[PDB]
Structures are given as structure tokens and as C-alpha cells.
Amino acid sequence: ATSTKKLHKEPATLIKAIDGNTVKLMYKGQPMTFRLLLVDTPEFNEKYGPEASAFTKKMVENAKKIEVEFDKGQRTDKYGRGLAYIYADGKMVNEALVRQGLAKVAYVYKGNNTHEQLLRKAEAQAKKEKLNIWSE
Numbered sequence: 529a530t531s532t533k534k535l536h537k538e539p540a541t542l543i544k545a546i547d548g549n550t551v552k553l554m555y556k557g558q559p560m561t562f563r564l565l566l567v568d569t570p571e572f573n574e575k576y577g578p579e580a581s582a583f584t585k586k587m588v589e590n591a592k593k594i595e596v597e598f599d600k601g602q603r604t605d606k607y608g609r610g611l612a613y614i615y616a617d618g619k620m621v622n623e624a625l626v627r628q629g630l631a632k633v634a635y636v637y638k639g640n641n642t643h644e645q646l647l648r649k650a651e652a653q654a655k656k657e658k659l660n661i662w663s664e
């Protein structure tokens with residue numbers, strides 16, 4: 529039997545937080561806009577939108593260390609954005625948004641679904657707790 533490589537975390541530097549599910553980072557010396565895998569936040573004009581933007585922003589702006597983890601599948605979306613799990617001092621931004629009820633699990637493609645179960649677990653806790661998007 530042979531294996532493939534285990535996902536891994538690569539460092540990157542904050543350029544700018546964009547919105548609840550998009551951050552721009554300096555990655556190997558070039559800017560790349562990253563779309564968070566497996567999540568969707570409300571838009572900035574919808575309810576909870578500003579809160580989702582602010583959450584992501586604080587998390588990445590406060591971080592000493594930001595890391596990018598690509599999944600096993602597609603690395604870019606149709607609009608050119610990198611698709612990744614983003615970590616701020618070892619805490620996954622994708623997961624923290626879902627746990628807070630500021631993102632739903634969404635855009636789940638089987639090619640790129642490594643942390644699906646971890647996020648669904650977060651979503652189930654946020655729904656039990658009636659947070660934000662689940663409050664009604």
C-alpha cells in the first residue's frame with residue numbers, strides 16, 4: 529500500500545480581514561485572498577453579518593501566528609480565491625465561526641471535506657445553544 533501526504537499547516541501573514549468568510553494573506557511572499565472552507569456567514573447587509581465580519585477580523589488581527597491548511601481537493605474557487613482552513617494561534621477560524629452560530633456549514637464538497645464532522649459538531653452545539661443564526 530502507499531499513502532498520500534497528511535494535510536499540513538503553512539504559515540502566512542495577515543494583510544487584511546475582508547468579511548466573515550474571507551481574509552487576505554501574504555502567502556509565500558504574494559497576496560492571496562482566502563475563502564474559508566466549509567462555511568458560510570451571513571452577508572454584511574444581512575442580519576448577523578456585521579457580527580460575523582467582526583469576529584473573523586478580531587481573530588485574525590489578534591493572532592501572533594496565522595496558518596493556512598489546504599484540504600485534499602481543489603485549492604482555488606471559481607473566482608480565484610484560495611480555499612483553506614485558517615488558524616489563528618492554533619484555533620481554526622472556520623470552526624470558531626460555526627461554534628459561535630455566526631456561520632452555517634455549507635459548500636461541503638466531498639473532494640474537500642476533511643473537517644466536516646468537526647464543524648457539524650460545532651454547528652450542533654451552536655444550534656442547541658440557540659446562538660445568533662440559530663436563535664430563531
Ligand SMILES: Cc1cn([C@H]2C[C@H](OP(=O)(O)O)[C@@H](COP(=O)(O)O)O2)c(=O)[nH]c1=O
Nearest residue numbers: 549550563564565566567568605606611635
Ligand atoms: C466555500 C466555497 C465557496 N465557493 C464559492 C461558491 C460561491 O459562489 P457562487 O454563489 O457563484 O457559486 C462563493 C460564495 O462566496 P461568498 O460566500 O464569499 O460570497 O464561493 C466555492 O466555489 N467553493 C467553496 O468550497
